[PDB]
Amino acid sequence: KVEEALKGADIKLLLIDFDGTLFVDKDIKVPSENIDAIKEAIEKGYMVSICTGRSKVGILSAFGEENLKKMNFYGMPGVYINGTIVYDQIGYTLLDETIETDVYAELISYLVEKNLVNQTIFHRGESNYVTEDNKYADFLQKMYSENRSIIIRHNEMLKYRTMNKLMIVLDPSESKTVIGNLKQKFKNKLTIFTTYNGHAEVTKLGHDKYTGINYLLKHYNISNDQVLVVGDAENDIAMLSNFKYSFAVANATDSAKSHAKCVLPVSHREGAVAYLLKKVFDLK
Amino acid sequence: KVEEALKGADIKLLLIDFDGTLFVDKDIKVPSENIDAIKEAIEKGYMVSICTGRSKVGILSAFGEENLKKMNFYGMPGVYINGTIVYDQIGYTLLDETIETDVYAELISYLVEKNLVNQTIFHRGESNYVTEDNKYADFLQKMYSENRSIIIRHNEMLKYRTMNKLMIVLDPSESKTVIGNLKQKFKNKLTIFTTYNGHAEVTKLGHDKYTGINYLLKHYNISNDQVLVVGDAENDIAMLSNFKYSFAVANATDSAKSHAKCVLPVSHREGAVAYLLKKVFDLK
Ligand SMILES: [Ca+2]
Numbered sequence A, B: 001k002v003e004e005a006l007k008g009a010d011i012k013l014l015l016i017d018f019d020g021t022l023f024v025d026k027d028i029k030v031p032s033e034n035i036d037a038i039k040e041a042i043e044k045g046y047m048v049s050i051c052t053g054r055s056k057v058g059i060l061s062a063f064g065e066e067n068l069k070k071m072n073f074y075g076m077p078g079v080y081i082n083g084t085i086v087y088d089q090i091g092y093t094l095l096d097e098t099i100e101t102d103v104y105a106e107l108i109s110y111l112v113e114k115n116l117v118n119q120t121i122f123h124r125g126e127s128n129y130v131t132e133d134n135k136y137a138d139f140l141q142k143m144y145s146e147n148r149s150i151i152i153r154h155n156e157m158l159k160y161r162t163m164n165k166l167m168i169v170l171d172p173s174e175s176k177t178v179i180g181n182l183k184q185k186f187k188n189k190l191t192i193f194t195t196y197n198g199h200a201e202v203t204k205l206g207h208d209k210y211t212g213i214n215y216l217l218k219h220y221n222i223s224n225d226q227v228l229v230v231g232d233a234e235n236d237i238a239m240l241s242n243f244k245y246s247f248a249v250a251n252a253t254d255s256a257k258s259h260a261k262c263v264l265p266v267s268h269r270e271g272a273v274a275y276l277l278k279k280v281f282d283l284k
């Protein structure tokens, strides 16, 4: 099933989702089987780009310094913050899109009246921020293997005129209600993806991983034919539907699985990425 | 609603769908109010781009030489063939994407097997072609006020290695059935949209009006904030979703109506483009 879906592919670019695909959890993180797979990928001439809602530093912290040295990979190139930040292979900033100030002012204003600021992670570039009254200040570290967000007073947070991303950490009690209301309030004003476990990710209208990825394709003159992509959740759908050699992990959402060419027989936990990469390697 | 939906918009680009939006049918073609609207938009300094599944010359035919003079508009800039052909204001080819030759070969092999070749309009650039045994040779001419398709022997048709688009003309009986089987034979291999009349428009994978439009945004450094868009059907949804000042005509499909910011109170035959542009004009 996989070998058939891969037949005839001349693959030059490997686009890998991070959470739910390459990264499994706080504990397993990225299995050594996957670190090896990328290591060999880079030795065999494949361009690797991770495509995530996370930042580069977020991805580098979850990997660890040792694994980076092991792979010889430092998140360049990469599509980050759901395609609003894109670096090339040598670190040039091909794209850095922040939310429009007016819309962003309307958003902070909503988040205050809806009382959600003290549970929002505020992202700009390679940094993220939370308020003094945030009970989940440890959240990206504890649950995603990142560094601790920087804690600042509430009225200092509202001084900033824009962000690349706002992650609203939601209780599974409130998710539906809060996201639905956020979606209708900022319909055609913001991009709002729902995290695997119920949180909201808010970015600039019109961008997602797929549009981030096009910058890399133009830059390095790589066609659709030559892209392998693999992912799991809502913000992977655009890149799963829009490439041919596209793959969903066994643990993917229903939508991810239907929009992908092919659903892998193996979960992220079981080394889905290493499994798929080795089947790409035996083509050449 | 509408003037509310436009509050404080600094619009510099008008992106107008053709059929179902600007162009009504055989007899009405494009209402005179719409022609004046475009005429004035160009005089008031707005960049205008028609975004459609049709070719440029297809749109210029339906318009007629006199209207083009009256508007001072000749389809440039433009997004044509669902984003696979794009012209800048001066007429430079920003993009001419054709189906991959391995996929195209498979596609034609599938069309013969299903005897669909004798009802399929083959598009390359500003030309389109049909087979000697095609009953629908007068189809674009009579139904859509275009120039007649060029007719050639079946064996001549399958000498061609690629096309920008195949529009499979379908009998309203067998739309659901034929497109269904088409969408699974070439899932993640081709873009297949369904026309308002249940016909199949087949283009290269990973392209739509939105991705084509982005060439114009980049070429002229126009931000999303500044883009006003209007449409009606399945092939408009990505541009209605990712833009802020996005409008669906009263006659739009349910999907288009929801993905847009705002549904117009007026339909395409009641002069919806004229209606919307007037409300955009008096912002200034
Ligand atoms: Ca993911």
Ligand SMILES: [Ca+2]
Pocket (backbone or CB within 6 Å): B017, B018, B019, B020, B021, B232, B233
């Ligand atoms: Ca249309």
Ligand SMILES: [Cl-]
Pocket (backbone or CB within 6 Å): A017, A018, A019, A051, A052, A053, A054
């Ligand atoms: Cl992710």
Ligand SMILES: [Cl-]
Pocket (backbone or CB within 6 Å): B017, B018, B019, B051, B052, B053, B054
């Ligand atoms: Cl159209």
